[PDB]
Amino acid sequence: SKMRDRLFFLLSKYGIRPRDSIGQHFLIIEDVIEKAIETANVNENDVILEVGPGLGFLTDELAKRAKKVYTIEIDQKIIEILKKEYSWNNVKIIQGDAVRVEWPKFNKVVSNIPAKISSPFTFKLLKTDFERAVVMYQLEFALRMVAKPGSRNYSRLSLMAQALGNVEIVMKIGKGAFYPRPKVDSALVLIEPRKDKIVLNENLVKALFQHRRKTVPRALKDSIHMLGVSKDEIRGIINNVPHSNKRVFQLYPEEVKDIEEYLKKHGIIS
Numbered sequence: 001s002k003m004r005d006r007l008f009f010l011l012s013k014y015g016i017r018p019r020d021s022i023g024q025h026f027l028i029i030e031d032v033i034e035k036a037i038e039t040a041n042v043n044e045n046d047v048i049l050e051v052g053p054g055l056g057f058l059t060d061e062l063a064k065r066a067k068k069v070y071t072i073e074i075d076q077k078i079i080e081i082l083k084k085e086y087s088w089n090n091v092k093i094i095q096g097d098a099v100r101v102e103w104p105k106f107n108k109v110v111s112n113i114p115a116k117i118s119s120p121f122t123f124k125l126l127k128t129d130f131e132r133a134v135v136m137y138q139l140e141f142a143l144r145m146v147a148k149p150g151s152r153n154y155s156r157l158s159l160m161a162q163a164l165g166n167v168e169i170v171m172k173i174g175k176g177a178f179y180p181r182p183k184v185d186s187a188l189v190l191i192e193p194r195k196d197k198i199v200l201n202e203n204l205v206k207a208l209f210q211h212r213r214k215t216v217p218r219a220l221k222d223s224i225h226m227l228g229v230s231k232d233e234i235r236g237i238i239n240n241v242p243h244s245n246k247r248v249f250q251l252y253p254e255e256v257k258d259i260e261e262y263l264k265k266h267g268i269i270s
């Protein structure tokens, strides 16, 4: 509460909303911010991306260690504050919604991720050339990011993490650590790019994982029929698809790749 009465002082000094929207959960322990930054190995060469800097507790700690930091904030009066409370030489504040703005070239991400964009952000970052990302998420979501094929909570997000990243939950972060207290705990999650990425088709993975409890012949038939295609013209091919004897939530990325390659061969995704 050295940082929490610092928060309260800033919130009141400018008049900023108690919980801005569902719940903006600002990070307020020095321990946690420093462990994020040390897991990241933020050196003076790095160029860092932060999403949602809030009152900039993490931002300022990143700014004194990295060459440059680009930080993306939706609230315009958080920015107006950031400009006044701080005097960074090496920070570019970027107004916008982190899902929609053009990202910088960066080699690292260290961020307290906004919960409502946890999934879109994860999918965007996963298709970026970064060496190391250290991102706090809600723990339920961080568990889905490391879930394994055939596990119940294995999903699009799981598959795409395993296809493209090395993902580690470093350690739980208690709700105590943010104001206001979330109703659930968080996790310090580490992502590095998989040295040998399995590049899958976005639209095919999306198709498959609308209903993941479905078998993959069923999954495929439904998704392509819904596109407008004749259900007659499509059954034979899709019946003979590789790994037809799995449900979609059982697929390893490699098994999704064979399915793509088969559909590519039979003209179905082109």
Ligand SMILES: Nc1ncnc2c1ncn2[C@@H]1O[C@H](C[C@@H](N)CC[C@H](N)C(=O)O)[C@@H](O)[C@H]1O
Pocket (backbone or CB within 6 Å): 023, 024, 025, 026, 051, 052, 053, 054, 055, 072, 073, 074, 075, 078, 096, 097, 098, 099, 112, 113, 114, 115, 116, 117, 138
């Ligand atoms: N889509 C978004 N793009 C950029 N900044 C955002 C977005 N959504 C929320 N923010 C900002 O995120 C800052 C603080 C957030 N890191 C807190 C999020 C919190 N950890 C949560 O799990 O909900 C605030 O200043 C918000 O304005």
Ligand SMILES: [Zn+2]
Pocket (backbone or CB within 6 Å): 140
């Ligand atoms: Zn749930």
Ligand SMILES: [Zn+2]
Pocket (backbone or CB within 6 Å): 168, 190
């Ligand atoms: Zn580690």
Ligand SMILES: [Zn+2]
Pocket (backbone or CB within 6 Å): 225, 231
């Ligand atoms: Zn029909």
Ligand SMILES: [Zn+2]
Pocket (backbone or CB within 6 Å): 242, 243, 244, 246, 255
């Ligand atoms: Zn198989």
